[model samples]
Target chain A: FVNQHLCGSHLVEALYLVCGERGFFYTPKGIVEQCCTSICSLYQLENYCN
Target chain B: FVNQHLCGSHLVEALYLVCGERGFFYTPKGIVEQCCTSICSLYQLENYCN
Candidate 1:
């Protein structure tokens, strides 16, 4: 059920904040990798509960 | 900032729920209009806070 709903936009926003406007030039593969990494790290934290 | 981040996917999901699988057969412009209407109405209610 719409798994991207939980983290897709948030991850995109994070990458934008880090990379600025030129971020859009990057590939979706890179963006997805960044999202997966960030999400996994977030899940590892106890207080980072969503 | 990512305004779409605040509302995009949720709006898409809402439209899909209302219109079902056949919804995407419509034009992007129509879908965007539906999303804006739903989002504005949702924003009207304080309890509807996301």
Candidate 2:
């Protein structure tokens, strides 16, 4: 067999670890540490609010 | 200062990644590759079901 990767609550937890209570935040530095770009990008949060 | 770690959903997801829909499994070679023993220990799973 091969291999595959899928994100689940693991990401949900990381967000809590980094962002905590709010579950989200905005920063000029943006792109908080533990978070992956795919999940929370500064550009997306500020501009698109993704 | 110091750093702290938490299980959160990140661990919740990691478990799903290794265990899948069955929720979990049994194997001598367990302590699956990606999963940390702190979260899913073969000895613990086998002995205590914790």
Candidate 3:
């Protein structure tokens, strides 16, 4: 029932791909927004989804 | 690229459904883990996925 744009879903997938296993920054565990946001900003993928 | 079980995917989808639009509590916005975790704790869905 989560109605998200294609971008949202894609964003989640991309975050997982880049940071899911070893993790990024302080979030060395799961798929949190901090990880997502940091990855987005670092890679200049901001408007790629958000 | 997000490697998750069926439960993980379903959990995200469910969280979006229950709290996506109006949100659950402090997070009055999009699909975030805070929203997901709080809803998971509140609804006894803790082990639903995590």
**lDDT per residue as tens, model 3, A1-50:** 23233334544445434443332221112333444344444364322222
Off by over 4 Å in 1: A25-30, A37-50, B1-50
Give interface RMSD (Å), model 3.
10.3
lDDT of 2 by residue, A1-50 (tens): 12112332333334434443333322212232334435654433333121
**Which candidate number has the best DockQ?**
2
Arranged by lDDT with the best first, the candidates are 1, 3, 2
CAPRI-style grade of the A/B interface in model 1:
incorrect
Candidate 3, B41: how far from true, in Å? Answer: 9.9
Residue A24's C-alpha lDDT in candidate 2? Answer: 34
Q: Judge candidate 2 at residue B6 and give its lDDT.
A: 15
User: TM-score of each candidate?
Assistant: 0.28, 0.23, 0.29
**Ranked by TM-score, top first:** 3, 1, 2
Q: What TM-score does the predicted chain A of each candidate obtain versus native chain A?
A: 0.39, 0.30, 0.34
Q: How do these models rank on DockQ, best leading? A: 2, 3, 1
Residues B7-41, candidate 2: write the lDDT tens digits. 44443344444444333322213333323333444
Which DockQ values do the candidates obtain, in the order shown?
Answer: 0.05, 0.07, 0.05
Model 2 bad stretches (over 4 Å): A1-50, B1-6, B24-50
